[PDB]
Amino acid sequence: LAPGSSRVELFKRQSSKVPFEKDGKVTERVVHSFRLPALVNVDGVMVAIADARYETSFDNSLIDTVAKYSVDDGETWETQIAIKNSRASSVSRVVDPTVIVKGNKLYVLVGSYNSSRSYWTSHGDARDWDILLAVGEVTKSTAGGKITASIKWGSPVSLKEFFPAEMEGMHTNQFLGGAGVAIVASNGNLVYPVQVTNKKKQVFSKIFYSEDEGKTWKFGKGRSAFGCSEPVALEWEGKLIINTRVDYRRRLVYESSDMGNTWLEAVGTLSRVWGPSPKSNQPGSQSSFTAVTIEGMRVMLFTHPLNFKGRWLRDRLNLWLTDNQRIYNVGQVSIGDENSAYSSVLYKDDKLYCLHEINSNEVYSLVFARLVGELRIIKSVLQSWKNWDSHLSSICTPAGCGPAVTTVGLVGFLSHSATKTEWEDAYRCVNASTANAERVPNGLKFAGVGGGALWPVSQQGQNQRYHFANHAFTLVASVTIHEVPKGASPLLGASLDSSGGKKLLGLSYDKRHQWQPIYGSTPVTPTGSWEMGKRYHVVLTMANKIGSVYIDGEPLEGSGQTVVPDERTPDISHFYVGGYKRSGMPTDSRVTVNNVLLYNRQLNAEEIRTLFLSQDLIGTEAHM
Ligand SMILES: CC(=O)N[C@H]1[C@H]([C@H](O)[C@H](O)CO)OC(C(=O)O)=C[C@@H]1O
């Protein structure tokens, strides 16, 4: 982790002690491993909840739920056991503690097991399982001229009575919380995203919520796909966003406007973006996923390990920042190549913290980190986002003023800034690589075999921030052709393969001064007319499997065709700009490209016409 940042080993493996209560007797007991961090703020007191695995890190062993709390931002802590297991056997355990804060109360939901030695999803029945809720009340005193906190943990109550034997077809077996930190919805509901099994041993996610302060609970009727576990959720613009774990696959993300009655995959923003390993073929993880306000902008924070080592090692814990449009990698929170899987991020009084695991030889500690550097970076990126959105929106468009340039769904913008080999994203998330490029105001001039710029889509590798483009996009640019080509040459497009030979949608230009719009695999029909040196406005749109190509605000003749067979979903390799950037491709595009914009939707007619009219006003050169 970053410059200026620091940590301590707070929950220390084989060292920290907790008050182990059995049969009315308490003994300070050393704990082998601590896992499943949840870090929250209750009325100014920081509270950290986790598993205390007494003798071993094996999942199916002796576990109580431990809590530490601090009134001085983590400088000093008191320690308690928030929830004890049944003591029925040497493997009795309360597990996957999931926390909600409302007023001065901490709602903690745990699974409770008595004697099984096997993993929960493997169970053929529910005989060893219960689902419990404990409430902790947090009070503060200023006696003695100091702040003293205390937390009184009530007895756990079983919520089993609220679990229906049947759901939309299936028969239910067990459920648990998704671990970490859940929420109170804007309407006051307590909301836990939960992981549920059926008699087929399939796992799936749902919304489990209470409209009466936790006295009664209900299930939404919809669900995730099968295979989605450990769900984590936040509320964004009136809707729940449910971020799920999928072992051996990319993470799936869903939105619901009705407490889980209906679930829609968020294909246009966050779903399938985050991979659980470099090859997305290893176990997933628990993730922190919260909505916060920083310097007045509403955003989301998300953590997940990169897992270069594989299996459940889960090294290299990374933190991400997004506004539901752009997706920025803040960086690695953990240190070196240490194993570091589960985590919890907290933003309190304009300070950022992380409670996370470190794992050596299957012995786990939780470190408590002060993310000083990470918050500095975050605030710089958010400033950049605000500044450019402000710039675009402040432009008085050719009428007094016409309609504003749209920033809604604007994800990336290539304009004046660039280096010898990169065209820089003004929004700072994804740069394009270049070859044979010369800098010019608000863009690049390209020439020669192998020339052009490449804006990676699936090529981003593990984490694919532009996976929305396989469902809808609008890509815009101003282009100027300097030489008549020998035969069709490319200007702009979306490629389905690494070379650019198989295109989803694109535009090329030919020796007869015609345009060559390319609609999927359809045979190309040249059309319209172009002139050398003239600056043209180009827009490619794709939505609902149909692509269109506009020139100067006007649809090329024949635009509006099918570019995706309704069976399949595309896997776009990259966008190419100003050529293919492939030496293996024989084309030589001699062109200047300025002001490339990528939106995560199909722009409408008015929007398209406004961008056309304000071409010469949107560049970044004059304002840095
Ligand atoms: C009850 C239980 O076994 N929980 C385990 C959990 C589980 O797999 C998931 O919460 C449900 O599918 O996974 C992990 C894990 O480090 O990957 C830690 C927990 O020990």
Automatic annotation (TrEMBL):
The keyword RNA-binding does not apply. One of its GO terms (biological process) is ganglioside catabolic process. It comes from the Eukaryota. Residues 407-605 form the Trans-sialidase C-terminal domain. GO terms for cellular component: cytoplasm; membrane. Disulfide bonds join C396-C401. Keywords: Membrane, Repeat, Signal, Transmembrane, Transmembrane helix. GO terms for molecular function: exo-alpha-sialidase activity. Residues 37-357 form the Sialidase domain. The keyword Transmembrane applies. This is Trans-sialidase. It comes from Trypanosoma cruzi. The chain holds residues 33 to 665 of 1060 of the full protein.
